């Protein structure tokens, strides 16, 4: 990859390979790293997005309505599925999530990492 | 075994500037997820450097936590692992040290913007 990577951007990213219940393959991800890191760091922190389910069932899941964000399907952000990617894995930028949606992402992220102290 | 937030585990991280190799990691996932989920979220620990030069890094003294070298926790190098990768538990970080980790996590993930 990108030229201005910003927090909340939804990128097509290469996650291959993984093992176990980890989410891999070329799939959409959301940038959750702060924008200073997104500019200077060689890597970005992302949360995985899946289309296998489209409804959020646990507090660390956030839904994306395709009638709003231009995806194949209604999708779910998996804030329990976080990984740091070299910026070369970011293929295409699909869109970005609104401030109101990133509010939900931030909440699920705080629950996911136990930042309730 | 139980997996608790703050535990320092030896985990097989290969394959992966992403950190790779059978390396020490610290559990940063909440304890409810550490019990019920098949996966845990961890932050990388490196022995290449010994000082935290940015606030997203947290140092840990080898004279305090039964460690190889004076290491640095990299709270911008975080990944979700299947629990089968966790090999041996070495120790755990105190509530004082995890508070620094929490703060570094707040910076790293940009949860500090208002």
């Amino acid at each position, epitope marked *: 990859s990108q030229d201005p990577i910003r927090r909340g951007d939804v990128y097509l990213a290469d996650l291959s390979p993984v093992q176990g219940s980890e989410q891999g393959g070329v799939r959409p991800v959301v940038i959750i790293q702060n924008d*200073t890191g997104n*500019k*200077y*760091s060689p890597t970005v922190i992302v949360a995985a997005i899946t289309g296998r389910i489209n409804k959020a069932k646990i507090p660390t899941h956030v839904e994306i309505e395709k009638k709003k964000y231009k995806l194949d399907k209604d999708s779910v952000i998996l804030l329990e599925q976080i990984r740091t990617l070299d910026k070369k894995r970011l293929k295409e930028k699909l869109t970005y999530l609104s401030d109101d949606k990133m509010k939900e992402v931030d909440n699920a992220l705080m629950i996911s990492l136990g930042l309730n102290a | 075994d139980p997996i608790r937030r703050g535990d320092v585990y030896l985990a097989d991280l290969s394959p992966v*500037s992403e950190q790779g190799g059978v390396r020490p990691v610290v559990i940063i996932q909440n304890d409810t997820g550490n019990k019920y989920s098949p996966t845990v979220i961890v932050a990388a620990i490196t022995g290449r*450097i010994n000082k935290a*030069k*940015i606030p997203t890094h947290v140092e840990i003294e080898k004279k305090k936590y039964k460690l190889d070298k004076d290491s*640095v926790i*990299l709270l911008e190098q975080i990944r979700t692992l299947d629990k089968k990768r966790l090999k041996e538990k070495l120790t755990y970080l105190s509530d004082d040290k995890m508070k620094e980790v929490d703060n570094a996590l707040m910076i790293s993930l940009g949860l500090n913007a208002v």
Partner: nanobody
Amino acid sequence: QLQESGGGLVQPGGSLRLSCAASGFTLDYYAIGWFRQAPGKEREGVSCISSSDGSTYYADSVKGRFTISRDNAKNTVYLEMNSLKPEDTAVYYCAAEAPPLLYDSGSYYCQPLYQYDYWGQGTQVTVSS
């Protein structure tokens, strides 16, 4: 340790060359950064290179105008500044980070908060008309 010079007063469109010399250690094994501090604004990483002469970062505000280069024979690093603009007015600092290095990435060491091992004393650059 880290001695720097080359600043001064220039008119818009002029050029300068900053120098950064080290005494007691070899700069070729270090990550080198050039930072500028303008009044009231955050420290800005303008040009940085890792210990390998093949991973250079330039700030977008200086891309095409500034050039960093290491002289391993003089143990010195330079910042060549061309087409200077009034918005380049600031105190310029060079900084060196000793190895081992965590990342071979110039941009990583140009982030505003990175605490380099060694810093220059700073030199004023002023561009006005």
